[PDB]
């Protein structure tokens, strides 16, 4: 039944089907003849000659007068640094014209922006105007802004990623997701700075900027003045941006209804900037004039996920976000406040009062949340965990609890928390990797009596930033 064969073949992946071409001359033709059975390629890594034979295989089989076929994923990366250039040259020189790469993941770390741009320009296999998604693990160049010219070159591009592994020396309605990731050690500026402040990206749903270094010479950058450019911005992730501050960010959030809707916010400054309190001061120019409308509510009213790991937010600032109901609660589902040194819980006798978190007020406000992360929150000693124990009645939605890499928390608090939680049916998942004080017999009791469906106790796991899953800070 020669017509239905693609439905059979597509249950099996490209390289494997290509090996299946060798079973017999008949099935070789039966496979080869159906070009749309191919929809992904992984050439990751590949040597030069095998990439030549891949290009050759396209030039033999996919070569067609009909302007039909398109490919949904083309991952390419060189086995060898010099051959990186040869592979990329051949790709943009000899790609068949009638065939459109939908999504190109050109992981070519040695190559520079300038060289990539040139290879598109003088390679002339024009699909790169017409592809849909792009990714470039490449060397940055500070000297020239060719990466902006990639977007100008690639008008159909909806999702772009750049991973500037190294350094060497107007309206963009199409775009939907911009992911900018940098090696903070090698990258010492901000690549898209001019583009982001000058242009608009009005349909931009998600933005993710990590590892960049904000310039000191530009308070418009440091005050997130550019960030006003992007309404409809469903999610913002921003992490290890060394010269940014959450203070300047909250000053933006004070004084504009910048976003009609954020579903998720994630901010993570790296170094400890001074204490930020929620700047609830509503000044009046005169009492004969209006107090300035503070846009914290309507900006943050939409959030499902709030993530502030490492950000030096004070505990009172977060309580004020809840008492003011700027954070909505009825819509919030996941809260990450790990690694925030300016959080203290009510049972602590040692404090400054505005670093206190009133967990009872907070958990009353936003009760329906699923997922809490308090990892690296050293302030969560065993005594402080008592506040969570008595506030168990307010967190009935909570499924996933990360408190890992806490060097204080004894298994006592863990156990009695899960036991009072059991008065709610296990907690779905709990993470205590690296917690040197949880006794192995206690966590084995947790497993044995089945107080948690899954609990992780990899004591030897030194770090928490799983790339892609937990963080987009590079390596």
């Amino acid at each position: 039944p020669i017509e239905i064969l693609p439905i059979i073949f597509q249950r099996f992946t490209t390289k494997e089907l290509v090996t299946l071409s060798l079973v017999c001359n008949k099935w070789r033709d039966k496979i080869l003849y159906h070009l749309d059975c191919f929809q992904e390629f992984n050439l990751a890594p590949i040597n030069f000659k095998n990439f030549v034979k891949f290009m050759d295989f396209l030039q033999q089989n996919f070569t067609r007068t009909y302007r039909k076929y398109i490919l949904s994923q083309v991952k390419v990366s060189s086995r060898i640094t010099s051959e990186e250039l040869r592979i990329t040259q051949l790709l943009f020189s000899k790609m068949p014209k009638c065939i459109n790469i939908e999504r190109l993941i050109l992981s070519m770390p040695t190559l520079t922006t300038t060289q990539i741009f040139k290879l598109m320009v003088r390679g002339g296999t024009d699909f790169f105007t017409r592809l849909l998604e792009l990714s470039l693990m490449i060397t940055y160049r500070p000297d020239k802004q060719h990466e902006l010219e990639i977007l100008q070159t690639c008008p159909l591009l909806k999702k772009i990623e750049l991973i500037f592994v190294n350094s060497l020396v107007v309206i963009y309605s199409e775009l939907e997701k911009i992911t900018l990731i940098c090696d903070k050690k090698k990258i010492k500026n901000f690549p898209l700075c001019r583009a982001l402040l000058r242009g608009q990206f009005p349909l931009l749903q998600k933005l993710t900027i990590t590892g960049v270094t904000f310039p000191m010479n530009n308070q418009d950058i440091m005050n997130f003045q550019w960030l006003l450019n992007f309404p409809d911005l469903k999610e913002l992730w921003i992490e290890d941006n060394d010269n940014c501050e959450l203070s300047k960010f909250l000053q933006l959030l004070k004084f504009s209804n910048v976003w009609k809707n954020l579903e998720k916010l994630t901010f993570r400054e790296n170094k400890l900037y001074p204490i930020v309190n929620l700047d609830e001061d509503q000044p009046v120019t005169n009492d004969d004039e209006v107090p300035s409308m503070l846009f914290y509510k309507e900006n943050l009213q939409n959030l499902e996920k709030l993530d502030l790991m490492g950000t030096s937010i004070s505990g009172s600032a977060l309580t004020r976000l809840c008492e003011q109901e700027y954070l909505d609660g009825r819509k919030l589902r996941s809260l990450n406040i790990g690694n925030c040194p300016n959080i203290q819980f009510p049972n602590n006798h040692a404090h400054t009062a505005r670093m206190i978190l009133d967990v009872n007020a907070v958990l009353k406000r936003l009760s329906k949340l699923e997922e809490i992360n308090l990892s690296h929150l050293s302030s969560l000693n065993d005594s402080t965990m008592k506040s969570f124990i008595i506030n168990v009645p307010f967190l009935e939605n909570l499924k996933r609890l990360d408190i890992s890499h806490n060097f204080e928390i004894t298994g006592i608090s863990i156990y009695e928390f899960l036991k009072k939680f059991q008065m709610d049916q296990p907690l779905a998942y709990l993470n205590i990797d690296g917690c040197s004080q949880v006794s192995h017999i206690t966590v084995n009791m947790i497993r044995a009596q089945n107080l948690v469906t899954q609990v992780d106790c990899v004591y030897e796991r030194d770090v928490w930033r799983k790339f892609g899953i937990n963080s987009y800070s590079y390596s």
């Binding site: 992981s107 990714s135 090696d183």
Partner: peptide, 21 residues
């Protein structure tokens, strides 16, 4: 996506460098 894997950089005398000022 790929977190970093190392490689050894190297330098030698070359015609461009030999043709520099």
């Amino acid at each position: 996506a790929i977190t970093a894997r190392k490689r050894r950089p190297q330098v030698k005398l070359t015609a461009e460098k030999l043709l520099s000022d």
